[PDB]
Symmetry: none
Subunit: 112 residues, 2 copies
Protein backbone atom coordinates (compact mmCIF):
# COMPACT_ATOMS: atom_id res chain seq x y z
CA UNK A 1 0.00 0.00 0.00
CA UNK A 2 0.57 3.71 0.02
CA UNK A 3 -1.00 7.16 0.37
CA UNK A 4 -2.73 7.14 -3.08
CA UNK A 5 -5.53 4.95 -1.60
CA UNK A 6 -4.35 5.45 2.04
CA UNK A 7 -4.06 1.62 2.22
CA UNK A 8 -1.02 0.56 4.31
CA UNK A 9 -2.94 -0.59 7.48
CA UNK A 10 -0.48 -3.42 8.32
CA UNK A 11 2.40 -1.99 10.42
CA UNK A 12 5.37 -0.97 8.24
CA UNK A 13 8.66 -1.21 10.21
CA UNK A 14 10.60 2.09 9.67
CA UNK A 15 13.34 1.69 12.32
CA UNK A 16 14.98 -1.68 12.97
CA UNK A 17 16.42 -2.77 16.34
CA UNK A 18 20.18 -2.78 16.23
CA UNK A 19 22.71 -5.46 17.22
CA UNK A 20 24.45 -4.32 20.42
CA UNK A 21 27.03 -5.19 23.04
CA UNK A 22 26.61 -4.40 26.76
CA UNK A 23 28.45 -5.01 30.07
CA UNK A 24 26.88 -7.23 32.78
CA UNK A 25 24.76 -5.15 35.19
CA UNK A 26 24.15 -2.29 32.72
CA UNK A 27 20.81 -1.20 31.21
CA UNK A 28 20.00 -2.06 27.55
CA UNK A 29 17.26 -0.74 25.28
CA UNK A 30 16.08 -1.93 21.84
CA UNK A 31 13.90 0.33 19.71
CA UNK A 32 11.65 -0.45 16.80
CA UNK A 33 9.40 1.98 14.91
CA UNK A 34 6.56 1.44 12.46
CA UNK A 35 3.95 3.37 10.45
CA UNK A 36 0.39 2.65 9.42
CA UNK A 37 -2.54 4.30 7.66
CA UNK A 38 -4.93 2.63 10.17
CA UNK A 39 -5.85 3.73 13.64
CA UNK A 40 -6.49 0.21 15.03
CA UNK A 41 -5.52 -1.37 18.41
CA UNK A 42 -1.82 -2.05 18.21
CA UNK A 43 0.18 -4.73 19.94
CA UNK A 44 3.92 -4.50 20.65
CA UNK A 45 5.79 -7.64 21.55
CA UNK A 46 9.44 -8.53 22.04
CA UNK A 47 11.02 -11.99 21.82
CA UNK A 48 14.44 -13.35 22.74
CA UNK A 49 15.68 -16.44 20.82
CA UNK A 50 12.27 -17.15 19.14
CA UNK A 51 10.50 -17.00 22.63
CA UNK A 52 8.03 -14.29 23.89
CA UNK A 53 9.17 -11.92 26.70
CA UNK A 54 5.91 -12.07 28.69
CA UNK A 55 6.80 -9.56 31.45
CA UNK A 56 8.91 -7.25 29.29
CA UNK A 57 9.22 -3.61 30.37
CA UNK A 58 8.17 -1.51 27.36
CA UNK A 59 7.77 2.15 26.41
CA UNK A 60 5.23 2.25 23.58
CA UNK A 61 4.33 5.35 21.62
CA UNK A 62 1.56 6.07 19.17
CA UNK A 63 1.34 9.35 17.20
CA UNK A 64 -2.09 9.15 15.64
CA UNK A 65 -2.91 11.40 12.63
CA UNK A 66 0.52 13.14 12.87
CA UNK A 67 0.34 16.89 11.92
CA UNK A 68 -3.41 16.37 11.19
CA UNK A 69 -2.60 13.94 8.37
CA UNK A 70 -3.51 10.31 7.64
CA UNK A 71 -0.30 8.75 9.00
CA UNK A 72 0.11 6.78 12.31
CA UNK A 73 3.61 6.56 13.79
CA UNK A 74 4.67 4.07 16.44
CA UNK A 75 7.74 3.34 18.51
CA UNK A 76 8.26 0.50 20.98
CA UNK A 77 11.26 0.57 23.31
CA UNK A 78 12.21 -2.70 25.06
CA UNK A 79 13.78 -1.90 28.45
CA UNK A 80 16.32 -4.38 29.88
CA UNK A 81 17.71 -3.52 33.29
CA UNK A 82 20.74 -4.95 35.17
CA UNK A 83 21.49 -7.33 32.16
CA UNK A 84 22.89 -10.83 33.07
CA UNK A 85 24.91 -13.25 30.86
CA UNK A 86 21.51 -15.04 30.37
CA UNK A 87 20.25 -11.74 28.70
CA UNK A 88 22.48 -12.60 25.65
CA UNK A 89 20.56 -13.69 22.54
CA UNK A 90 18.75 -12.55 19.41
CA UNK A 91 15.99 -10.00 20.17
CA UNK A 92 13.06 -9.44 17.84
CA UNK A 93 10.14 -7.06 17.78
CA UNK A 94 6.69 -8.07 16.59
CA UNK A 95 4.30 -5.17 15.88
CA UNK A 96 0.75 -6.06 15.00
CA UNK A 97 -2.88 -5.01 14.60
CA UNK A 98 -5.82 -7.02 13.16
CA UNK A 99 -4.56 -6.41 9.56
CA UNK A 100 -1.23 -8.22 10.21
CA UNK A 101 2.04 -8.75 12.13
CA UNK A 102 5.39 -7.29 11.17
CA UNK A 103 8.58 -8.94 12.37
CA UNK A 104 11.74 -6.89 12.85
CA UNK A 105 15.27 -8.08 12.01
CA UNK A 106 16.83 -10.17 14.78
CA UNK A 107 19.14 -7.90 16.78
CA UNK A 108 21.83 -9.75 18.64
CA UNK A 109 22.72 -8.75 22.20
CA UNK A 110 26.22 -9.68 23.41
CA UNK A 111 26.86 -9.57 27.21
CA UNK A 112 30.46 -9.22 28.47
CA UNK B 1 10.32 16.95 9.96
CA UNK B 2 11.16 18.71 6.60
CA UNK B 3 13.35 15.83 5.28
CA UNK B 4 11.16 13.04 3.77
CA UNK B 5 10.30 10.19 6.20
CA UNK B 6 9.78 6.82 4.43
CA UNK B 7 6.47 5.24 5.62
CA UNK B 8 6.22 2.33 3.09
CA UNK B 9 9.26 0.35 1.88
CA UNK B 10 9.52 -1.37 -1.62
CA UNK B 11 9.17 -5.16 -1.26
CA UNK B 12 11.38 -7.98 -2.61
CA UNK B 13 9.53 -9.73 -5.46
CA UNK B 14 9.68 -12.46 -8.08
CA UNK B 15 8.26 -12.15 -11.63
CA UNK B 16 8.14 -14.15 -14.90
CA UNK B 17 9.94 -12.89 -18.06
CA UNK B 18 7.64 -10.65 -20.15
CA UNK B 19 5.34 -9.72 -17.22
CA UNK B 20 4.85 -6.25 -15.68
CA UNK B 21 6.35 -5.35 -12.25
CA UNK B 22 5.77 -2.40 -9.90
CA UNK B 23 7.68 -1.18 -6.80
CA UNK B 24 6.14 1.33 -4.42
CA UNK B 25 7.60 3.64 -1.80
CA UNK B 26 5.79 6.21 0.38
CA UNK B 27 7.03 9.11 2.51
CA UNK B 28 5.77 12.04 4.57
CA UNK B 29 7.03 15.55 5.26
CA UNK B 30 5.95 18.44 7.44
CA UNK B 31 7.28 20.64 4.57
CA UNK B 32 5.47 21.50 1.29
CA UNK B 33 8.82 21.80 -0.61
CA UNK B 34 9.63 20.56 -4.21
CA UNK B 35 9.89 16.80 -4.13
CA UNK B 36 12.21 14.52 -6.21
CA UNK B 37 11.54 10.76 -6.70
CA UNK B 38 14.27 8.55 -8.06
CA UNK B 39 14.70 4.82 -8.55
CA UNK B 40 17.98 2.89 -8.89
CA UNK B 41 18.80 -0.70 -9.85
CA UNK B 42 22.06 -2.13 -8.38
CA UNK B 43 23.14 1.43 -7.13
CA UNK B 44 22.72 2.78 -10.74
CA UNK B 45 20.17 5.53 -11.51
CA UNK B 46 17.13 4.68 -13.68
CA UNK B 47 17.16 7.88 -15.72
CA UNK B 48 14.23 6.93 -18.03
CA UNK B 49 12.18 5.10 -15.42
CA UNK B 50 8.40 5.08 -15.84
CA UNK B 51 7.01 6.50 -12.56
CA UNK B 52 3.63 7.32 -11.03
CA UNK B 53 4.30 9.97 -8.36
CA UNK B 54 1.64 11.18 -5.97
CA UNK B 55 1.54 14.12 -3.59
CA UNK B 56 -1.33 14.62 -1.13
CA UNK B 57 -0.63 18.10 0.18
CA UNK B 58 -2.22 19.21 3.51
CA UNK B 59 -4.15 15.87 3.72
CA UNK B 60 -7.54 16.20 5.50
CA UNK B 61 -6.77 19.93 5.97
CA UNK B 62 -3.78 19.09 8.20
CA UNK B 63 -0.12 20.15 7.99
CA UNK B 64 1.18 16.83 6.71
CA UNK B 65 2.42 16.23 3.11
CA UNK B 66 2.05 12.58 1.96
CA UNK B 67 3.85 11.05 -1.04
CA UNK B 68 3.90 7.83 -2.99
CA UNK B 69 6.17 6.90 -5.92
CA UNK B 70 5.42 3.84 -8.06
CA UNK B 71 8.20 2.47 -10.30
CA UNK B 72 6.64 0.80 -13.40
CA UNK B 73 8.54 -2.00 -15.15
CA UNK B 74 6.97 -3.44 -18.30
CA UNK B 75 7.75 -6.63 -20.29
CA UNK B 76 10.57 -7.54 -17.80
CA UNK B 77 13.73 -9.19 -19.15
CA UNK B 78 16.33 -11.32 -17.30
CA UNK B 79 18.44 -8.07 -17.29
CA UNK B 80 15.60 -6.49 -15.13
CA UNK B 81 16.83 -8.68 -12.18
CA UNK B 82 18.63 -6.78 -9.41
CA UNK B 83 18.24 -4.76 -6.22
CA UNK B 84 15.86 -1.79 -6.65
CA UNK B 85 16.02 1.27 -4.42
CA UNK B 86 13.98 4.44 -4.05
CA UNK B 87 15.48 7.82 -3.21
CA UNK B 88 12.98 10.50 -2.09
CA UNK B 89 14.36 13.97 -1.57
CA UNK B 90 13.75 17.67 -1.11
CA UNK B 91 16.43 20.37 -0.65
CA UNK B 92 16.59 19.44 3.12
CA UNK B 93 17.76 15.92 2.43
CA UNK B 94 17.41 12.52 0.79
CA UNK B 95 15.83 9.39 2.21
CA UNK B 96 16.98 6.02 0.86
CA UNK B 97 14.61 3.06 0.91
CA UNK B 98 15.63 -0.55 1.67
CA UNK B 99 16.97 -2.44 -1.35
CA UNK B 100 14.17 -4.62 -2.77
CA UNK B 101 15.40 -7.56 -4.80
CA UNK B 102 13.68 -8.47 -8.09
CA UNK B 103 14.07 -12.08 -9.29
CA UNK B 104 13.23 -12.83 -12.98
CA UNK B 105 12.39 -16.45 -13.97
CL1 LIG C 1 18.15 -0.55 19.10
CL1 LIG D 1 6.83 -2.77 -3.66
CL1 LIG E 1 22.77 -3.11 -5.23
CL1 LIG F 1 22.44 16.04 6.39
Amino acid sequence: XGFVCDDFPKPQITVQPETQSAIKGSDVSFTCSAASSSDSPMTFAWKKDNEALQDAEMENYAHLRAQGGELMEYTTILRLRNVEFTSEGKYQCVISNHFGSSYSVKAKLTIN
